[PDB]
C-alpha cells in the first residue's frame, strides 16, 4: 500500500516520499489526518500535475 506523503512524519518525511506504509496506518491515521493520499495511477498523475508545476517550473 503506497501513499504519497504531504507532510513531515518521523521515519517517512519528505513530500512525495511514496513509502509502503502498512494498510491500517494508511487508512486510519494518514487518510483522516490529510498527511497522505493513495498512490494509484490517477492520483499519481495528480501528484505529477503538481510535480511538473513545481520541480521543473522553479527553474
Amino acid at each position: 500500500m503506497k501513499v504519497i506523503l504531504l507532510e513531515p512524519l518521523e521515519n517517512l518525511g519528505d513530500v512525495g516520499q511514496v513509502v509502503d506504509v502498512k494498510p491500517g496506518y494508511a487508512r486510519n491515521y494518514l487518510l483522516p489526518r490529510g498527511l497522505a493520499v493513495l498512490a494509484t495511477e490517477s492520483n499519481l498523475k495528480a501528484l505529477e500535475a503538481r510535480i511538473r508545476a513545481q520541480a521543473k517550473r522553479l527553474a
Binding site: 494498510p23 487508512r27 487518510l31 483522516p32 493513495l38 492520483n43
Partner: protein
Amino acid sequence: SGKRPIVANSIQRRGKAKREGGVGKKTTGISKRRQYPNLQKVRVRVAGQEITFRVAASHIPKVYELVERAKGLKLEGLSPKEIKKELL
C-alpha cells in the same frame, strides 16, 4: 450477515475425516454437517460526513475507492444511497 458492496454469505458442509489419506494409506470421511460460513464483515467508518458501512474487509480498499470521490452533492444527512448507486 450482509452484503454492502459484495455477495451474501454461503453455506458449507464440514466433511470431517479420520484417516491416513491416500498418499500415505487408506482414507475416509466422517460427518457432513453444515458449517454456515458467515463472510468477513467489518463496520467501516468513512468521512463523507459520518458514513458507516458493513464492508467485506476484502473490500475495504474498494470502499476507500468509493470514498476517493466528489459526487457533486451536499448533505441530506444520511446519503449512502448516492455513494452505493454511483458504484460500478
